[PDB]
Amino acid sequence: KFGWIKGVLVRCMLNIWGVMLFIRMTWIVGQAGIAYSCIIVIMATVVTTITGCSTSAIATNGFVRGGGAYYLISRSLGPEFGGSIGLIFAFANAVAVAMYVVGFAETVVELLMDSGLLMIDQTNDIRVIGTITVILLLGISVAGMEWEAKAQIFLLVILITAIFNYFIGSFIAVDSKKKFGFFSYDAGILAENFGPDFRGQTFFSVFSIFFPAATGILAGANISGDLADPQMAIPKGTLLAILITGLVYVGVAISAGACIVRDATGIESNFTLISNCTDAACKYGYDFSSCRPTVEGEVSSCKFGLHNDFQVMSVVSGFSPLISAGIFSATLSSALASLVSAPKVFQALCKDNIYPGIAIFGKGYGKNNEPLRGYFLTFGIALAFILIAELNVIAPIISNFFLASYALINFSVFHASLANSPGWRPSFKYYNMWASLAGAILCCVVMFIINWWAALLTNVIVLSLYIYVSYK
Amino acid sequence: KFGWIKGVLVRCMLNIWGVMLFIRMTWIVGQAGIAYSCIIVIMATVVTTITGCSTSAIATNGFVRGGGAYYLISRSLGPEFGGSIGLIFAFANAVAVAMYVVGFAETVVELLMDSGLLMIDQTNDIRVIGTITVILLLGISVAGMEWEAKAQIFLLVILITAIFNYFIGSFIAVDSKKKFGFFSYDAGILAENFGPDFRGQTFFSVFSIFFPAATGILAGANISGDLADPQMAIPKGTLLAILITGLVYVGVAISAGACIVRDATGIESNFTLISNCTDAACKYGYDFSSCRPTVEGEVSSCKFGLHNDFQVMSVVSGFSPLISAGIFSATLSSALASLVSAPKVFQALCKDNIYPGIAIFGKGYGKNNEPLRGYFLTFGIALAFILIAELNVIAPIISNFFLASYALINFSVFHASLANSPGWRPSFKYYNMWASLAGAILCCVVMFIINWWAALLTNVIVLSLYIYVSYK
Numbered sequence: 001k002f003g004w005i006k007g008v009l010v011r012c013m014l015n016i017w018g019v020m021l022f023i024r025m026t027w028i029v030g031q032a033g034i035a036y037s038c039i040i041v042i043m044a045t046v047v048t049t050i051t052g053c054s055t056s057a058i059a060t061n062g063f064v065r066g067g068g069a070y071y072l073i074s075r076s077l078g079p080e081f082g083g084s085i086g087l088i089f090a091f092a093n094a095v096a097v098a099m100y101v102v103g104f105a106e107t108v109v110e111l112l113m114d115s116g117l118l119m120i121d122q123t124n125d126i127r128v129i130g131t132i133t134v135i136l137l138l139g140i141s142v143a144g145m146e147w148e149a150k151a152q153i154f155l156l157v158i159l160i161t162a163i164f165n166y167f168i169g170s171f172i173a174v175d176s177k178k179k180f181g182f183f184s185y186d187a188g189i190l191a192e193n194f195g196p197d198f199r200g201q202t203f204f205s206v207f208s209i210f211f212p213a214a215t216g217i218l219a220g221a222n223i224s225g226d227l228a229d230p231q232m233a234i235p236k237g238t239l240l241a242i243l244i245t246g247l248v249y250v251g252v253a254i255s256a257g258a259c260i261v262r263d264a265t266g267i268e269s270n271f272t273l274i275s276n277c278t279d280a281a282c283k284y285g286y287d288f289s290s291c292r293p294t295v296e297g298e299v300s301s302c303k304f305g306l307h308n309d310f311q312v313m314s315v316v317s318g319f320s321p322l323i324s325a326g327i328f329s330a331t332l333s334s335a336l337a338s339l340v341s342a343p344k345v346f347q348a349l350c351k352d353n354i355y356p357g358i359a360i361f362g363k364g365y366g367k368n369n370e371p372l373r374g375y376f377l378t379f380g381i382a383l384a385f386i387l388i389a390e391l392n393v394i395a396p397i398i399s400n401f402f403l404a405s406y407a408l409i410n411f412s413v414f415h416a417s418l419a420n421s422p423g424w425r426p427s428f429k430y431y432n433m434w435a436s437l438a439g440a441i442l443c444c445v446v447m448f449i450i451n452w453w454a455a456l457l458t459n460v461i462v463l464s465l466y467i468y469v470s471y472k
Numbered sequence: 473k474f475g476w477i478k479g480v481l482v483r484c485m486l487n488i489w490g491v492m493l494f495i496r497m498t499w500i501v502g503q504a505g506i507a508y509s510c511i512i513v514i515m516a517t518v519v520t521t522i523t524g525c526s527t528s529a530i531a532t533n534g535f536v537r538g539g540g541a542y543y544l545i546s547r548s549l550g551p552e553f554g555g556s557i558g559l560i561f562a563f564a565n566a567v568a569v570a571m572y573v574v575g576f577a578e579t580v581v582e583l584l585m586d587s588g589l590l591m592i593d594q595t596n597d598i599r600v601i602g603t604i605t606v607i608l609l610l611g612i613s614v615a616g617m618e619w620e621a622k623a624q625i626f627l628l629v630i631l632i633t634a635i636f637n638y639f640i641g642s643f644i645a646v647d648s649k650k651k652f653g654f655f656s657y658d659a660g661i662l663a664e665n666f667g668p669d670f671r672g673q674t675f676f677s678v679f680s681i682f683f684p685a686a687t688g689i690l691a692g693a694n695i696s697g698d699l700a701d702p703q704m705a706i707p708k709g710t711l712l713a714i715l716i717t718g719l720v721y722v723g724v725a726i727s728a729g730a731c732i733v734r735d736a737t738g739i740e741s742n743f744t745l746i747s748n749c750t751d752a753a754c755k756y757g758y759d760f761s762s763c764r765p766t767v768e769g770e771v772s773s774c775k776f777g778l779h780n781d782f783q784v785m786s787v788v789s790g791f792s793p794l795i796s797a798g799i800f801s802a803t804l805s806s807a808l809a810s811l812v813s814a815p816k817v818f819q820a821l822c823k824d825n826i827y828p829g830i831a832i833f834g835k836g837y838g839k840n841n842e843p844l845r846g847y848f849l850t851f852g853i854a855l856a857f858i859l860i861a862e863l864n865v866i867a868p869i870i871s872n873f874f875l876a877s878y879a880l881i882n883f884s885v886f887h888a889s890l891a892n893s894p895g896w897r898p899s900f901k902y903y904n905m906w907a908s909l910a911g912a913i914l915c916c917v918v919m920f921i922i923n924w925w926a927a928l929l930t931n932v933i934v935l936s937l938y939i940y941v942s943y944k
């Protein structure tokens with residue numbers, strides 16, 4: 001049995017911190033402003049805080065022993081909400097595996113292209129490296145699960161040293177790191193980056209790429225049978241990990257916006273103060289014109305800055321090669337946590353014969369009854385999406401399915417509080433049914449703003465799976 | 473008590489034939505093709521045929537005496553579906569009143585501008601004439617309802633003479649009617665108009681303006697307490713009126729497309745055969761170039777043809793002034809049928825205290841207990857939408873709310889057949905629950921394609937009104 005720190009807090013902080021922390025935060029401050037990106041982080045934190053209060057209200061409804069994620073939901077609420085939440089959550093983690101390993105493969109491909117190693121084109125090397133790293137992540141999940149419970153504190157002390165490396169490298173003004181952007185903390189760059197640019201995107205198109213960085217909060221409730229006291233561990237670690245990771249996202253956004261310019265040519269300039277005809281806040285001798293795009297229907301033909309290079313946190317970092325290779329720790333820990341959590345929920349769902357034909361993905365081979373057909377189905381669903389070797393098209397799909405699962409959780413606890421269900425007495429201090437209704441309406445409306453036909457498909461599927469289990 | 477002809481068939485044919493028959497059919501053949509407009513008419517006929525089978529399945533579920541539209545639905549199915557169908561249907565007819573009288577006012581304004589009568593600008597004369605014609609339509613509904621039961625056969629023999637006037641004026645080739653478009657039935661014009669143009673619109677933007685011409689099919693079920701035998705009158709007249717009006721729409725579309733060109737300058741040409749350098753199917757001596765638009769982001773600066781003038785059926789007609797002033801008959805009959813049917817449903821809903829605060833719109837003043845507060849609320853909701861003095865922005869709203877009401881009817885009969893409701897034995901020969909489910913899914917998907925945020929608002933409102941009445 002684990003305590004609340006090592007069993008809930010470290011698990012949720014390792015699942016939440018993933019691709020977008022080191023790869024795509026600076027791009028989000030580049031597209032939006034500092035103000036709009038802080039509004040984005042606060043909105044995702046509001047959604048996940050309401051869903052964390054709803055999950056805590058489920059977890060404090062009696063039912064200590066014999067836990068899990070599907071078990072608590074399907075036993076506090078009915079099977080109609082429980083089966084649909086289980087199916088949508090299993091599919092969401094199975095598709096999130098692809099997002100994390102595509103981010104890992106993109107980082108490895110850019111590290112190879114900084115050297116001379118280049119086999120095929122850039123979008124085909126992500127398909128090759130992403131395929132090798134998901135058939136190796138599959139082998140760990142079915143043969144090496146014992147060491148993974150010890151390795152997670154190792155992964156967390158790699159990740160926090162990466163974050164501290166970035167934050168203390170921001171204050172060190174290096175003259176060689178100019179021409180890649182990155183001057184010191186400056187007021188001119190802070191005023192220039194305070195306000196949107198949206199060079200090909202929109203608000204709610206940048207939100208759909210941020211919001212996978214806020215998911216992963218049900219990693220503590222996914223192990224309730226391995227906790228000491230789940231009534232006190234699940235509301236503590238979840239709502240603490242949400243606060244810690246949200247504050248690190250806000251700090252990364254403000255710190256990236258206040259010291260890096262949006263565009264930069266990677267050519268140094270001999271001047272130290274440019275002729276007074278630009279006034280574009282680079283008074284340090286750098287003229288970063290002829291990189292802003294001409295028309296308002298094209299991307300910039302630059303190579304560095306906040307808008308362009310995707311890896312500028314390795315430039316800002318004091319020791320970029322090894323310490324800011326906590327990208328590997330973050331992405332592989334989140335992908336491995338999502339590779340073992342999607343067949344687990346699906347095997348727990350396929351043991352109650354709720355849905356007719358899926359009952360063959362429940363036969364756990366071996367001694368611990370690990371679902372091997374579930375692992376191979378998750379590997380197939382992940383490998384279908386790795387072949388879309390682009391993160392910015394995978395991430396709105398994950399955002400859609402996680403907003404659907406969180407909306408279903410919030411609406412199910414609202415409906416159980418409203419309907420006066422027989423076994424529903426949630427003794428949690430910060431649970432209100434109208435906050436859950438507000439969170440469900442907010443998740444559904446944002447899911448429709450992001451992409452309306454995928455939202456309509458997901459809502460029709462969830463309504464069909466509810467009406468099927470009602471009249472059975 | 474009425475028979476099935478005079479009580480159902482004439483009522484449904486007068487409610488269905490409305491604005492779009494004489495005003496906006498030729499514009500729909502102008503924007504789309506002949507093929508796409510026939511596909512549009514067949515889709516609207518499929519939706520209304522499935523909804524007519526569902527309404528017949530409700531109407532054959534016992535319950536002869538003491539009828540109405542709200543009564544049959546709320547007594548065969550529950551109050552949860554019945555109250556929401558009643559509210560959405562009351563709002564749909566209350567807003568459709570504005571569409572019919574805005575079409576009437578637009579016709580009267582164009583007839584005045586063909587003369588010298590012009591008080592204010594064109595969009596402000598529709599607001600003035602549309603306001604006078606809805607406070608005069610209100611006086612008939614509360615003081616002259618006795619003569620209206622005799623006047624409807626008069627209105628129908630005006631309307632069918634208008635239709636025959638158009639269809640026999642199509643075959644009469646008049647040389648003076650050229651330069652307004654309108655050559656004879658020609659193969660070149662039929663081949664030229666066979667294929668879309670979409671000069672500012674899209675498919676499903678032209679469908680949203682057509683589909684109010686297919687609504688009005690519940691005008692026979694809205695009077696079940698005044699019928700002789702509603703078990704045999706409501707499935708007969710509804711499904712016959714749908715077929716008759718759909719065939720007249722298909723005939724009008726094909727006949728308009730095969731004899732009128734899309735653009736035309738209203739200037740006659742002395743030539744009888746133009747120099748062979750255009751080949752634009754007007755070999756009759758007319759050169760209708762310099763009216764096609766240059767860029768693909770603007771409307772044509774022409775004045776006549778299928779795309780432009782909105783009143784070309786009065787040009788094709790043999791006697792345009794009096795007989796093709798069946799526009800007044802069609803629009804005023806449909807507006808008067810929707811002004812007496814929205815307070816009726818709403819007063820029947822406000823007598824069962826389902827929704828809390830609306831109970832004051834049920835107190836019928838007078839001897840027949842006509843709901844006067846309901847009439848004034850319908851007049852207010854209509855007059856709010858008449859001030860948007862443009863038909864092409866009113867008509868997608870009516871399309872949204874009627875697709876919502878028809879989707880609710882189809883889903884309610886599917887859900888009652890699936891759930892095995894206690895008093896649900898629909899002895900109708902052509903009712904199937906999967907056809908009703910297909911009609912409900914089709915109406916919901918089309919409602920989302922037309923406008924997604926209005927569809928999301930309507931679906932959230934209907935979901936809230938269902939969950940309110942369930943847990944009361």
Ligand SMILES: CCCCCCCC/C=C/CCCCCCCC(=O)O[C@@H](COC(=O)CCCCCCCCCCCCCCC)COP(=O)([O-])OCC[N+](C)(C)C
Pocket residue numbers: 087091460461463464465467468471472876877879880883890891892912913916930931934
């Ligand atoms: C403005 C307002 C607009 C409103 C418009 C409405 C909105 C539109 C809403 C539309 C909602 C559609 C609801 C459909 C209802 C399903 C039919 C059903 O209930 O079961 C039927 C089919 O039984 C089966 O064998 C099929 C089992 C799966 C069917 C559902 C999953 C399909 C979607 C998931 C796809 C895969 C997902 C998995 C991968 C992610 C039962 O058959 P039976 O013979 O009748 O059983 C008799 C027993 N009984 C009488 C007691 C019942």
Ligand SMILES: CCCCCCCC/C=C/CCCCCCCC(=O)O[C@@H](COC(=O)CCCCCCCCCCCCCCC)COP(=O)([O-])OCC[N+](C)(C)C
Pocket residue numbers: 460461464889905906907909910913914917
């Ligand atoms: C955009 C426009 C879309 C238009 C098409 C939309 C597709 C929807 C169209 C659906 C219509 C097609 C299904 C009909 C099949 C019936 C087979 C049959 O005849 O046997 C039996 C059914 O028993 C069955 O086996 C039913 C199997 C179908 C269940 C799945 C329903 C579709 C779920 C949809 C999920 C959402 C779909 C989207 C999700 C991805 C006969 O029925 P019965 O049980 O005997 O009861 C009859 C009793 N009578 C005796 C009352 C008096």
Ligand SMILES: CCCCCCCC/C=C/CCCCCCCC(=O)O[C@@H](COC(=O)CCCCCCCCCCCCCCC)COP(=O)([O-])OCC[N+](C)(C)C
Pocket residue numbers: 404405407408411418419420437440441444458459462828932933935936937939940943944
């Ligand atoms: C992918 C999946 C994503 C899923 C996301 C899903 C998200 C979709 C979101 C869907 C939102 C739907 C949920 C909201 C419904 C709540 C109803 C309610 O709470 O009322 C309750 C109180 O409230 C009141 O008394 C208010 C007064 C009546 C207002 C009617 C409700 C609001 C309707 C607004 C429409 C405006 C219409 C304007 C035109 C008229 C009823 O009070 P009660 O009677 O005491 O009930 C006690 C029950 N008991 C006795 C058993 C204890």
Ligand SMILES: CCCCCCCC/C=C\CCCCCCCC(=O)O[C@@H](COC(=O)CCCCCCCCCCCCCCC)COP(=O)([O-])OCC[N+](C)(C)C
Pocket residue numbers: 417431432433434437438441442445932936
């Ligand atoms: C769009 C994106 C952003 C969306 C965000 C905004 C979206 C709006 C979302 C949510 C809005 C929040 C509503 C706040 C209501 C608080 C009033 C109150 O305390 O009532 C209470 C006082 O009991 C009474 O004295 C009766 C008062 C009327 C009941 C209020 C119901 C409001 C229905 C609103 C219908 C909304 C339909 C929505 C349709 C659109 C009654 O309940 P209770 O006693 O507290 O029960 C506690 C039981 N428990 C102890 C087990 C927990």
Ligand SMILES: CCCCCCCC/C=C\CCCCCCCC(=O)O[C@@H](COC(=O)CCCCCCCCCCCCCCC)COP(=O)([O-])OCC[N+](C)(C)C
Pocket residue numbers: 202203204205396445448449450451452453925928929932
């Ligand atoms: C009136 C009530 C206000 C509610 C405010 C609540 C907070 C709202 C906050 C903020 C409001 C939204 C501001 C930004 C608008 C979205 C811009 C955008 O991204 O385009 C969008 C739509 O394109 C449109 O047409 C947008 C038109 C406005 C719709 C949004 C308001 C309706 C809110 C809901 C009304 C229901 C209310 C439910 C009950 C409460 C996206 O277009 P797409 O084609 O789908 O994307 C394709 C994606 N792809 C590229 C990957 C393929």
Ligand SMILES: CCCCCCCC/C=C\CCCCCCCC(=O)O[C@@H](COC(=O)CCCCCCCCCCCCCCC)COP(=O)([O-])OCC[N+](C)(C)C
Pocket residue numbers: 453454456457460674675676677913917920921922923924
């Ligand atoms: C199977 C049941 C499963 C249920 C779920 C299925 C998922 C849904 C299935 C299908 C949805 C497919 C739509 C994707 C559109 C691409 C993105 C886009 O452009 O959005 C636009 C599409 O609005 C348009 O009209 C654009 C022009 C046509 C584009 C294709 C329409 C559908 C094609 C044929 C499909 C035939 C479907 C079958 C019907 C015969 C949105 O813009 P808007 O909404 O128009 O804004 C209006 C605002 N205004 C009023 C202020 C102007």
Ligand SMILES: CCCCCCCC/C=C\CCCCCCCC(=O)O[C@@H](COC(=O)CCCCCCCCCCCCCCC)COP(=O)([O-])OCC[N+](C)(C)C
Pocket residue numbers: 411415444459460462463466467470471916928931932934935938939942
């Ligand atoms: C885009 C819109 C945004 C929101 C999307 C919604 C997301 C949907 C996801 C989750 C929401 C779940 C929906 C229902 C909520 C439960 C409340 C309820 O209905 O209680 C009822 C149960 O319900 C039933 O028994 C059958 C469900 C019928 C719902 C029909 C809604 C029609 C509105 C169409 C508009 C929606 C169109 C959606 C778009 C196509 C009554 O409770 P009971 O007495 O306990 O019943 C016992 C019966 N039993 C013994 C057999 C078990």
Ligand SMILES: [Cl-]
Pocket residue numbers: 016017018019020021212213214
């Ligand atoms: Cl992430």
Ligand SMILES: [Cl-]
Pocket residue numbers: 215216217218219
């Ligand atoms: Cl999660």
Ligand SMILES: [Cl-]
Pocket residue numbers: 488489490491492493684685686
């Ligand atoms: Cl009409």
Ligand SMILES: [Cl-]
Pocket residue numbers: 687688689690691
């Ligand atoms: Cl109707």
Ligand SMILES: [K+]
Pocket residue numbers: 015016017018019212213214215216334
């Ligand atoms: K994450």
Ligand SMILES: [K+]
Pocket residue numbers: 487488489490491684685686687688806
């Ligand atoms: K009509």
